[PDB]
């Protein structure tokens, strides 16, 4: 059974797709951000088309494996949040039917846009209700469910408060200083963090995601070294890959990467809004939190 997406998940999708497809220029990027924020799939060009493909696949309305829309997932998305939604039976019926009629002829950006575009023009507001595409609807859901990570909340402090609670402050302090204490709480902590960073999904590690956090610190040159390590790690548990990285010649680079990613986890739109990498600010922020934790 397919599981509906949380507002954390869809916000991850939206921000990641914008990161991947917004142009690096300035005059160009502003148009795209302004339009996409209003859910306007304009202007119609390769940038917008591939952004559309990326969102459609992150929301998982389009299946890359089966290479086809899976319309039943619409229904799923709705039932999971059918009261907080604001969506009606008729709206979801028609949206599901329209998506059921789509056979895009291929899976390129251009063809998927050409297929789905009239559906989006017609049912954009249904899509925004179902997939938490408004600040009000997402806020309603967050408020209904205390187990979801919030917008401005760090993945790491979230996972800490779920895994350690108010117990083992000493082990949590050592863990936040990158100690391999080997305790059960630290293992669950690293699993929680890897799941939320998408370093691991459905049990399989995601080497491209770690590599990308290495690129984000201007250490792309380490990508091969980051692959060897992860491809040679014999375990399958997050703590295994974590320890492989910490007990390596790229330990300190890994900490720089991890800390930047923590900072960017407390605000999914960090790169969209235009923030850049600043090792000093990153570590200053980390030092404030760690001095509080180890207080």
Ligand X SMILES: NCCc1c[nH]c2ccc(O)cc12
Binding residues for serotonin, as ranges, are 160, 242, 259, 262, 286
The radius of gyration computed from the CA coordinates of the chain, to the nearest angstrom, equals 20
Contact present, 191 and 185 (Cβ < 8 Å): no
Q: Residue 260 CB, nearest distance to ligand PUC (Å)?
A: 20
Binders of ligand X in range 180-239 (CB under 6 A): 186, 189
**Interface with ligand PUC by CB under 6 A: which range of 32-40, 75-83, 248-256, 285-293?**
32-40
Binder of ligand X out of 69, 95, 123, 156 (CB under 6 A): 156
- Nearest-10 Cα torsion for 220, 223, 226, 230: 140
Distances (CA, A) of 22 to 31, 40, 58, 113, 186: 10, 14, 16, 17, 37
Residue number, 145 or 170, with CB nearest to ligand X = 170
Binding-site residues for thromboxane A2 sit at 36, 51
**Interface with ligand X by CB under 6 A: which range of 9-17, 133-141, 170-178, 267-275?**
170-178
**Interface with ligand X by CB under 6 A: which range of 22-30, 72-80, 202-210, 258-266?**
258-266
204-209 long-range contacts, CB within 8 A, separation 24+ = 205/230, 205/236, 205/241, 207/231
Q: Residue 295 CB, nearest distance to ligand X (Å)?
A: 14
The entry of ligand PUC, ligand X, none that residue 191 binds, CB within 5 to 8 Å by partner kind: none
Task: Report the C-alpha gap between 238 and 189 in whole angstroms.
Answer: 9
Q: Residue 251 CB, nearest distance to ligand X (Å)?
A: 12
For Cα atoms 192, 151, 12, give the angle at the middle one, nearest 5 degrees: 65
49 binds ligand PUC (CB under 6 A): no
B/e letters for 254-263, b = 16+ CB within 10 Å, e = fewer, are bbbbbbbbbb
Contact present, 187 and 163 (Cβ < 8 Å): no
Q: Which helix (H) or strand (E) holds 106?
A: none
Residue number, 56 or 126, with CB nearest to ligand PUC = 56
Residue number, 72 or 182, with CB nearest to ligand PUC = 72
Residue number, 172 or 271, with CB nearest to ligand X = 172
């Amino acid at each position: 059974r397919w599981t509906a997406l949380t507002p954390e998940e869809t916000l991850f999708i939206y921000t990641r797709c914008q990161e991947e497809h917004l142009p690096a220029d300035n005059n160009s990027r502003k148009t795209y951000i302004e339009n996409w924020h209003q859910w306007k799939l304009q202007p119609n060009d390769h940038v917008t088309q591939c952004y559309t493909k990326c969102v459609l696949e992150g929301l998982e309305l389009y299946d890359g494996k089966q290479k086809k829309f899976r319309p039943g997932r619409v229904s799923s998305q709705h039932v999971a949040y059918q009261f907080l939604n604001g969506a009606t039976a008729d709206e979801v019926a028609k949206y599901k039917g329209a998506i059921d009629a789509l056979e895009p002829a291929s899976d390129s950006c251009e063809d998927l846009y050409m297929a789905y575009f009239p559906v989006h023009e017609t049912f954009v507001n249904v899509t925004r209700k179902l997939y938490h595409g408004t600040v009000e609807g997402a806020a309603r859901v967050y408020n209904s469910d205390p187990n979801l990570k919030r917008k401005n909340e760090s993945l790491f402090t979230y996972c800490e408060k779920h895994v350690y609670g108010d117990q083992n402050r000493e082990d949590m302090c050592r863990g936040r200083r990158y100690e391999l204490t080997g305790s059960d709480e630290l293992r669950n902590m690293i699993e929680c963090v890897f799941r939320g960073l998408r370093y691991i999904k459905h049990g399989d590690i995601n080497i491209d995601e770690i590599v990308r956090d290495f690129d984000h610190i201007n250490r792309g040159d380490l990508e091969p070294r980051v692959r060897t390590i992860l491809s040679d790690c014999r375990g399958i548990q997050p703590y295994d890959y974590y320890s492989c990285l910490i007990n390596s010649d790229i330990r300190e680079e890994f900490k720089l990467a991890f800390d930047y990613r923590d900072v960017r986890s407390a605000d999914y739109a960090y790169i969209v809004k235009g923030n850049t990498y600043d090792a000093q600010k990153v570590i200053a922020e980390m030092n404030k939190v760690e001095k509080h934790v180890c207080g």
